[PDB]
């Protein structure tokens, strides 16, 4: 009955995103019969990396606007000003995001 | 009412570690939540397709690695593979 105190699998992987919740969503999402132990760790790390990349670009875009809070416009500016992120979120509409200020050069 | 899980506290922890003095509105938090759910479903569906093509029953970290390599474009895939590999290799040595 000498049961150790529970450590979350996010802390063993060094992550902020939940490894156990990603494991449950992989098991209940009808993806395969079996889910390996390292698959939710790898997936939670990839999701944490992508979230951190978008949030850092949006925080930089909010700081350039002299704002301290990220609004949907800052996420839209972070995503559409980056070719890889615009290619990843290609057919994605961000609500309240607006458009890029693109006026055609032949008009001026 | 039910429990209605989300990713808001993890997105907030990640934001506090990349921008310690920056907040986020609730409309942008919903967009980040939708983004995490969409990328989860994309990677998990591609890994399910990869396990089915090879007649495997298990989604391992190898299937997740090749699904990330198929879905993310450019250097995004390289740094995501680096992050997932270092998380798996420090998880197994624990």
């Amino acid at each position: 009955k000498a049961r150790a105190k529970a450590k979350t699998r996010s802390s063993r992987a060094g992550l902020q995103f939940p490894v156990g919740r990603v494991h449950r969503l992989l098991r209940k999402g009808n993806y395969s019969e079996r889910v390996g132990a390292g698959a939710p760790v790898y997936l939670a790390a990839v999701l944490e990396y992508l979230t951190a990349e978008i949030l850092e670009l949006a925080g930089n875009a909010a700081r350039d606007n002299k704002k301290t809070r990220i609004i949907p416009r800052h996420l839209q500016l972070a995503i559409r000003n980056d070719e890889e992120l615009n290619k990843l979120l290609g057919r994605v509409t961000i609500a309240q995001g607006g458009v890029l200020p693109n006026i055609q050069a032949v008009l001026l | 009412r039910s429990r209605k899980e989300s990713y808001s506290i993890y997105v907030y922890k990640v934001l506090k570690q990349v921008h310690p003095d920056t907040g986020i509105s609730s409309k942008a938090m919903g967009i980040m939540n939708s983004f995490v759910n969409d990328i989860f479903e994309r990677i998990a569906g591609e890994a399910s397709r990869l396990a089915h093509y090879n007649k495997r029953s298990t989604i391992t970290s190898r299937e997740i690695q090749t699904a990330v390599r198929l879905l993310l474009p450019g250097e995004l895939a390289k740094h995501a593979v680096s992050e997932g590999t270092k998380a798996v290799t420090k998880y197994t040595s624990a």
Partner: single-chain antibody
Amino acid sequence: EVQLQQSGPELVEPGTSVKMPCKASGYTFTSYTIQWVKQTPRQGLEWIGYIYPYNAGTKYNEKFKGKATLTSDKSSSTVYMELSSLTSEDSAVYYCARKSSRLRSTLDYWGQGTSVTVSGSMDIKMTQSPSSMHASLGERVTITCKASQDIRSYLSWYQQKPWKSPKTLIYYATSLADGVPSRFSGSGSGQDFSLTINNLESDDTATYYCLQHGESPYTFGSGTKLEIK
């Protein structure tokens, strides 16, 4: 492979303007920024600015506003750099370097260099603690790059043999670059960083720079010249 074909040297007079191309090949040209670095043998490496050819978006160092102007050309996959109102201070080698738009990426591939021969306190200072050292042929070498402010891990290490372009060793303060052996090892976060070379070879004699890219002007280290026996 990825090549950044740069033009040959010039011998000009003051007041002139020089366009130096950075024709790129081997990769998707719009997906990567092209950075510009000036190397004088008085202040070392200085970061001029970049241009992102995906949207023609530039960002300059405040030390080079008005002096430098970056343009791109999607048809020829070529980035130009104009140097207006040339002074005697503007005689150096100007490298163009490819950096991805990802935040943890660094200046990966460099051009050969174009040697121009003519006839600011709120930045981050990179302090390399040994300015030079001498080493054996198999012992340990450790170079440090104590910083001014808190960069998180956005620090890379470069090796420059004389009369050659710099070569990336380590990015993101620990990760090995492509084609770099595991003798090179990086560590640190916050303000103090370290580069360790484990077993020295005959070709490990060069100048070793550290580059931060965590804040808005990028600042190189002062340099560490390593001689071996």
